[PDB]
Amino acid sequence: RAKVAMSHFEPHEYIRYDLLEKNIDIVRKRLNRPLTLSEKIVYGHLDDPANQEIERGKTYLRLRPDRVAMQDATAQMAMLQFISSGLPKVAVPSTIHCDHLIEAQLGGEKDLRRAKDINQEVYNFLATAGAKYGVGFWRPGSGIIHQIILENYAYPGVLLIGTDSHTPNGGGLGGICIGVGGADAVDVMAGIPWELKCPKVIGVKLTGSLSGWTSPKDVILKVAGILTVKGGTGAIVEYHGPGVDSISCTGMATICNMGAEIGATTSVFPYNHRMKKYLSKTGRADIANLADEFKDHLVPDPGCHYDQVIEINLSELKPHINGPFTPDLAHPVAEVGSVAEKEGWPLDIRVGLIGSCTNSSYEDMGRSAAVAKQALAHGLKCKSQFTITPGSEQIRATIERDGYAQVLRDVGGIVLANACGPCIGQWDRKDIKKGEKNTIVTSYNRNFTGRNDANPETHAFVTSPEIVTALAIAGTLKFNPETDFLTGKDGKKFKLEAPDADELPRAEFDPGQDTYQHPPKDSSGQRVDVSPTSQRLQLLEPFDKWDGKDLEDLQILIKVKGKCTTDHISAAGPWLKFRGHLDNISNNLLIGAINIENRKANSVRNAVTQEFGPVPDTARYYKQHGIRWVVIGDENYGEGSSQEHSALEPRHLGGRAIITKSFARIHETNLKKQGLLPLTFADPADYNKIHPVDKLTIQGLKDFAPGKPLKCIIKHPNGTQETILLNHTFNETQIEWFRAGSALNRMKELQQK
Ligand code: SF4
């Protein structure tokens, strides 16, 4: 049949739409119903389509991903696990992207130069580990993992896994793209099936079309606000309706990206002519013509069943701005000034930030450059400090060329490197003292406490790039671009017109500089060397096998109250220096969670010494004194970033299990990967029966079975004991992960010795 390749860097690796169509037909004959598109791509990729038991919300799917993509903050450890597996070459297409370790201070050239001095040990390690296991290396300066995947590797019907929670961006080009932790990526690179819990499916029906100030961003600001951060847990959001053609391929990618802030497994859009056009503009018109031929299998069946259906009329949608401490608190731009005032949100905006992978496209930058030029033409500049982060070299080279970059500098913006930077908090922020109370509006996705500048008093809002620009000219939340009047140099009160710009370059894309390095697959005789005195990289030492015993009299390290996001468990910013080193990064364990006893961060009672201390130190105390421990947590524990570190570091410091009312998807899978026991209250009111002082015995591990709950005895100080039941989502593939001590230890017992 056709021999069309996956990318311009893997020409011998062919797109298998012929497989997709065979597995779809087998599955559809067993189910006898319409399949949604996500169902066609996910079941179309099953390892065993004829025997795979399929229940939405219940079964685990043995799947076969087409490719793996890692960024450098989650990549080092993924490769440290791959090294430990013993295997010689990765088994599917795989890439590493250096975007995460590049700190914004001075602006792109210098910053990029500095970060290459500063992170030389890591980048070198990644490029050598790549050269060796046959993994593609995109160099520091290339771009952000999600912009490079959409411009180069995402296509209709790909199943892609990425070690990042914002991998769902790829659903803008019609594939199923799921964020995972470095251990799920090791399965796939090692050739062992990847298991996913069969998604439920939220249908969003889009109607009418966008105009003027309204953009893509607003559509998911609106959905985020309607579903709340836990509304899409265990579900894919499938967009459909006549309104989908009205949105560019770029914007469909924005909507899918931020579907991660409502915890969705991923998001997907149906292949359509705005994607055809994008594939052709980015050198892939052959994939586009091959996808016209399989179009049927790349769009939903007639009459397919959504578990939930939300209708969004695009034509009535208003600009929004979400926040400031969660992405699901939505306001129409029109009302946020009035609300800010009412709440003590600092109305004056200190920094406007535009870019990141959620919103640094050619169309996003043109829409921003078109608000910027109207200010300039009346002699203005930003009241607010203004930074621009292009999502790729290709976008920095083309907007530069088509003259957008210039306009953004003339209004006073600084063009940062094509790197995450301020989005992840790699930002040497100096315009505020720590704990100063300020506002910043971003075109980003996540705005949770102190994410961008580590200052917990920063009120960070997320809106769209053209809104960030218009409000950065105002320097106030008190400015609605639709109604209000600016004042030029000329003494004249003007209004700002709605931006219209080209979705794609008139000419084609200017690729920029040399940033890729393909694996020499001739040599591969690189020694990937880890200096044993390195503070950045350390080889993993395997975890203990399970002792065959019940986990008796466990100590509660912390009983967490409210929101305990991954970044509370393992913080980023300055800690990203240690993502290759398990011991020095363990020093950030749970320092950001609030303790229910005293309601502080990083202050828990040591049980022995009765002094209140830091959580890492206290867990290291219990480990050094043989005290096995547990974390009691509330709802949607582990929400956020996909980083497996939130699960390696508790296991490192003697953690045994984490009991919560609910878990976020990725985090729960990482805790199981690492031999820890993720569990949930059979009744969430039981959380109230546990106080910090009690000891807990998890009873029944010997006949740990799927669907069978576990017994937990609460041993109170006073000889009283309650038994509660704890549910778990294990299956027997995962119970062997527990028994072996971790997934990787299990994999190495399967390796014959
Ligand atoms: S830190 Fe921000 S710019 Fe980087 S991949 Fe995540 S969402 Fe995108």
Curated annotation (Swiss-Prot):
UniProt modified residues of type Phosphoserine: S531, S642
Residues modified to N6-acetyllysine: K22, K110, K116, K205, K489, K495, K545, K577, K695, K702, K708, K711, K715
Bias-annotated ranges (Basic and acidic residues): 496-509
Protein keywords: 4Fe-4S, Acetylation, Iron, Iron-sulfur, Lyase, Metal-binding, Mitochondrion, Phosphoprotein, Pyrrolidone carboxylic acid, Transit peptide, Tricarboxylic acid cycle
Pfam families recorded: Aconitase (PF00330), Aconitase_C (PF00694)
Gene Ontology CC: one annotated term: mitochondrion
UniProt-listed Enzyme Commission number(s): 4.2.1.3
Cofactor, free-text remark: Binds 1 [4Fe-4S] cluster per subunit. Binding of a [3Fe-4S] cluster leads to an inactive enzyme.
Domain of life: Eukaryota
InterPro entries recorded: Acnase/IPM_dHydase_lsu_aba_1/3, Acoase/IPM_deHydtase_lsu_aba, Aconitase/3IPM_dehydase_swvl, Aconitase/IPM_isomerase, Aconitase_4Fe-4S_BS, Aconitase_4Fe-4S_dom, Aconitase_dom2, Aconitase_mito-like
Binding positions for [4Fe-4S] cluster per the UniProt entry: C357, C420, C423
Compositionally skewed regions (Polar residues) per UniProt: 523-533
Post-translational modification remark: Forms covalent cross-links mediated by transglutaminase TGM2, between a glutamine and the epsilon-amino group of a lysine residue, forming homopolymers and heteropolymers.
PANTHER family per record: ACONITATE HYDRATASE B, ACONITATE HYDRATASE, MITOCHONDRIAL
Function in brief: Catalyzes the isomerization of citrate to isocitrate via cis-aconitate.
Family the UniProt entry places it in: Belongs to the aconitase/IPM isomerase family.
Protein name, as recorded: Aconitate hydratase, mitochondrial
Originating gene: ACO2
